[PDB]
């Protein structure tokens with residue numbers, strides 16, 4: 001086919017086939033968690049993704065400022081594939097059309113056909129949502145993929161360089177040193193906190209006059225940040241952010257983004273609506289999920305998905321409603337659950353175990369959930385294990401749970417240490433775990449590397 | 455001035471001046487070793503260099519394949535500057551003309567004036583010499599600066615990708631997997647060895663068919679590799695290189711480099727001259743020093759330098775012959791010594807100590823060596839401490855000495871461990887030392903990162 005140059009087929013065995021062809025879309029939390037658990041001797045497993053590596057997304061906000069290095073939080077797909085007992089095929093390409101009628105996926109490669117399947121596992125994720133707000137794509141940076149980390153560093157480094165040539169009182173200097181982060185979830189909060197850490201811990205030590213003039217803004221439409229946590233943790237988080245000099249704009253929406261300024265509209269608690277023009281040098285847009293084009297295209301082809309908006313509606317067995325043989329997990333699937341890596345991972349593990357049982361029942365190996373129900377398959381039940389968020393300045397919040405029971409809840413320095421330990425344990429490869437560990441040790445003794453060219 | 459955006463002046467004290475203006479050209483072994491030892495309270499110290507960081511050159515051959523990371527072997531100049539007690543000025547620019555008549559250096563910035571001096575310390579180094587051989591600059595890669603490391607990785611990665619799409623017996627596949635390294639000194643030998651390590655230790659584990667078809671060529675005009683070592687070590691080195699499958703072409707000169715092949719001419723020991731067309735995919739040109747344009751320009755302006763070729767001829771006090779106030783150290787200076795980091799470092803330390811004594815004698819602070827001779831300054835005496843070279847496959851050679859006495863001489867696994875320990879001790883910053891240490895630990899457990907995009 002016309003797939004990219006990082007494409008492969010592993011060769012653990014000599015392929016004759018009798019086995020169903022299982023095609024996975026994506027190389028992220030859902031796809032790779034599924035790959036880790038799927039039996040590649042029961043099924044012929046293929047993967048379509050434009051990205052030849054897994055990204056440990058929870059540490060992406062640490063990468064732009066060099067708290068961790070970009071290499072440390074990625075792992076090539078081939079390394080996961082080579083742990084499998086059977087053969088794995090990877091096509092470096094993006095799915096452009098899912099064709100349920102003829103059981104194929106049309107692919108195109110950026111760096112260059114229809115790929116057949118018996119079962120499809122869609123895990124392409126979601127893209128950042130700009131909500132049609134003008135100027136976001138022209139002037140803002142997303143914080144979603146490794147290239148975004150590099151772009152943010154290049155932008156902020158260039159702004160610091162330009163600001164440094166202007167006199168202390170110049171409003172252009174002040175503007176160039178202004179950062180606006182939109183989104184009060186973990187990504188935006190952690191982006192803000194990591195930037196504030198860089199500025200106050202490292203930049204201050206060699207460019208103190210620049211550092212003291214940096215202003216970080218966090219903008220969020222809801223009345224609180226981190227609304228997945230209990231109220232006292234959200235309040236603690238906001239108070240801490242404010243204590244580190246981050247200006248938090250709650251109940252605030254960005255109406256437009258222009259080149260050198262953006263318009264923020266606040267609906268205050270008293271009901272008044274005010275507008276503020278916020279000059280900015282660096283805009284990070286860290287909010288909103290929306291369905292990718294290949295997914296919104298699929299909505300039109302399955303009657304039961306015609307009303308879908310956020311993602312593919314899936315049943316208790318993670319089948320795409322209206323399809324006998326397409327499953328969806330993670331951010332591209334709507335199952336009434338939050339768009340988190342935790343959800344993607346559990347969905348993937350559940351689904352892989354279902355595929356083990358499916359190989360024992362002849363009807364699967366030759367009312368869409370009839371066979372699942374007749375054979376007494378348990379429905380998927382998400383177990384919320386809690387939530388973590390780094391807040392800058394060696395503070396984190398954490399709620400740790402399982403079922404109705406909460407084991408731990410709190411914030412402070414101890415919680416930051418817990419945050420680090422838990423994140424290390426959740427990294428999917430030993431290589432990436434060691435690299436992140438070393439990044440953090442180096443950080444205890446030395447400043448971060450903040451190089452525009454590396 | 456019109457210097458680049460990484461330019462700075464440190465502000466340890468409030469500058470009034472009475473002190474001579476000492477201007478350093480470069481940010482490499484000579485310049486940074488000199489900076490480390492120069493008293494910035496006795497002198498107003500400025501630096502002109504287009505590169506805002508120090509490069510630990512002895513580990514550059516390890517960088518293309520990810521034995522070490524590029525970040526690990528560099529250190530920003532500002533970090534050395536901030537260790538000094540006085541103020542240090544850095545201009546991100548290249549010296550384009552040294553103007554001895556008016557005691558200035560003309561600068562231009564790549565990323566944009568005449569800078570005055572009382573004393574000039576030239577340490578701009580030398581550039582790779584192609585010897586006018588056609589095609590070297592069109593098709594070859596130097597191995598001199600960080601961007602070259604990135605370029606070599608991009609080229610070899612792209613070649614492996616292309617070769618992987620061709621059938622096992624295709625001569626284009628074989629060509630794309632052919633590497634030619636020109637130069638049998640430490641740089642070329644280590645480049646070859648590091649590439650052979652990557653191919654046989656890492657690539658082989660996931661692309662064995664590609665790996666087994668890679669051919670590395672080492673081409674050298676002299677009858678032996680590593681001619682700075684004793685004969686038995688050179689012979690051991692060649693034998694080891696050959697034992698790892700590197701084809702060593704001694705007594706061989708490259709007559710021309712074309713796009714897909716180069717012509718190698720061998721004068722055999724029996725006197726016959728043969729030609730071989732060597733197909734290649736990656737060419738690394740790791741031989742020959744030549745004077746940079748700013749230096750060859752200076753030859754014409756000082757009568758005593760009119761006959762100079764290799765570099766500025768310097769006297770026993772490292773003064774440029776024909777100048778009262780220009781000194782030169784490292785590869786841009788000819789003192790009858792080899793172009794090595796060891797020589798540059800000793801020259802720099804010697805010269806900085808001379809500047810300490812110069813500040814005590816009024817004639818320096820307001821026959822070019824008359825004042826040095828009258829005041830009984832000791833001439834510079836190079837102390838050869840030995841030589842080290844990595845050979846791939848966990849083997850190194852080492853000769854360790856001081857004066858007439860040799861403490862150690864040998865090759866093998868133990869010498870490789872010694873090579874690592876010695877290299878770590880010679881890195882100029884604790885940050886870089888820790889990063890290299892961590893790179894090597896990670897390598898003991900995991901494959902190298904060989905990413906075209908990072």
Ligand SMILES: Cc1cc2nc3c(=O)[nH]c(=O)nc-3n(C[C@H](O)[C@H](O)[C@H](O)COP(=O)(O)OP(=O)(O)OC[C@H]3O[C@@H](n4cnc5c(N)ncnc54)[C@H](O)[C@@H]3O)c2cc1C
Nearest residue numbers: 026027028029030051057058095124125330331339340341
């Ligand atoms: C910066 C950041 C920090 C986060 N932190 C946390 C956290 O701390 N905790 C938490 O629970 N969640 C976190 N999340 C959310 C979590 O990353 C997502 O919920 C998770 O990525 C969902 O997994 P997924 O497999 O659906 O999507 P992803 O992991 O995004 O993977 C999607 C994959 O599909 C590929 N792809 C895209 N288009 C196509 C196409 N057309 N065809 C084929 N493949 C395609 C992509 O390249 C990618 O490999 C974070 C997200 C971000 C962006």
Ligand SMILES: Cc1cc2nc3c(=O)[nH]c(=O)nc-3n(C[C@H](O)[C@H](O)[C@H](O)COP(=O)(O)OP(=O)(O)OC[C@H]3O[C@@H](n4cnc5c(N)ncnc54)[C@H](O)[C@@H]3O)c2cc1C
Nearest residue numbers: 480481482483484505511512549578579784785793794795
């Ligand atoms: C890959 C490699 C491996 C090596 N390994 C070893 C080894 O193991 N042992 C050993 O003893 N030696 C080694 N060397 C040799 C050693 O690096 C040189 O002898 C040493 O660099 C000389 O120091 P220098 O200060 O003269 O030049 P450099 O260290 O090359 O520094 C020159 C500086 O001048 C700057 N510059 C260039 N043009 C201008 C301009 N117009 N104006 C101002 N600044 C300019 C450059 O950016 C650079 O900062 C190696 C060299 C290479 C390339």
Ligand SMILES: C/C=C(C)/C=C\C=C/[C@H](OC)[C@@H](C)[C@@H](OC)[C@@H](C)CCc1oc2c(O)c(OC)cc(OC)c2c(=O)c1C
Nearest residue numbers: 058340341342345383385386387388399400401402422426
């Ligand atoms: C009786 C107990 C049962 C039945 C199961 C687990 C019990 C204890 C666990 O720890 C031992 C659990 C408390 C601890 O870790 C799971 C939680 C902090 C997990 C919280 C947690 O997890 C994630 C996770 O697991 C992922 O997987 C790859 C991915 C994730 O995206 C970042 C997360 C995640 O963001 C969070 C917050």
Ligand SMILES: C/C=C(C)/C=C\C=C/[C@H](OC)[C@@H](C)[C@@H](OC)[C@@H](C)CCc1oc2c(O)c(OC)cc(OC)c2c(=O)c1C
Nearest residue numbers: 512794795796799837839840841842853854855856876880
């Ligand atoms: C009586 C002893 C005296 C008076 C002085 C030193 C004695 C022992 C030393 O080790 C303790 C010495 C043996 C040991 O290290 C210096 C040698 C292996 C050094 C060999 C050595 O050195 C370099 C060096 O030093 C540099 O400096 C920055 C830079 C260098 O470029 C890479 C080198 C270098 O390439 C080599 C080979």
Ligand SMILES: C\C=C(C)/C=C/C=C\[C@H](OC)[C@@H](C)[C@@H](OC)[C@@H](C)CCc1oc2c(O)c(OC)cc(OC)c2c(=O)c1C
Nearest residue numbers: 394413414416417418419420421422424440441443444445
């Ligand atoms: C007597 C017997 C033994 C084995 C003694 C071991 C002593 C230290 C260990 O190293 C060897 C070390 C690994 C261990 O203890 C600090 C941590 C995992 C504990 C948790 C811990 O603490 C931190 C810490 O304390 C810091 O302090 C300045 C800084 C830190 O980051 C900013 C951390 C940290 O991020 C974590 C996770």
Ligand SMILES: C\C=C(C)/C=C/C=C\[C@H](OC)[C@@H](C)[C@@H](OC)[C@@H](C)CCc1oc2c(O)c(OC)cc(OC)c2c(=O)c1C
Nearest residue numbers: 848867868870871872873874875876878894895897898899
């Ligand atoms: C009983 C009391 C103590 C303190 C015991 C300490 C044991 C190990 C140390 O780690 C804690 C370790 C740092 C130390 O010993 C291996 C090295 C510096 C010794 C020199 C050494 O050896 C290597 C080695 O042996 C390897 O083997 C598979 C691999 C190696 O690279 C490829 C090296 C190596 O590159 C070096 C420099």
Ligand SMILES: [Mg+2]
Nearest residue numbers: 026028031123
């Ligand atoms: Mg995925």
Ligand SMILES: [Mg+2]
Nearest residue numbers: 028029055057
């Ligand atoms: Mg992702």
Ligand SMILES: [Mg+2]
Nearest residue numbers: 125330331332
């Ligand atoms: Mg998904």
Ligand SMILES: [Mg+2]
Nearest residue numbers: 124125126331
């Ligand atoms: Mg996603």
Ligand SMILES: [Mg+2]
Nearest residue numbers: 480482485577
């Ligand atoms: Mg230098």
Ligand SMILES: [Mg+2]
Nearest residue numbers: 482483509511
């Ligand atoms: Mg250099």
Ligand SMILES: [Mg+2]
Nearest residue numbers: 579784785786
């Ligand atoms: Mg020099």
Ligand SMILES: [Mg+2]
Nearest residue numbers: 578579580785
């Ligand atoms: Mg040089």
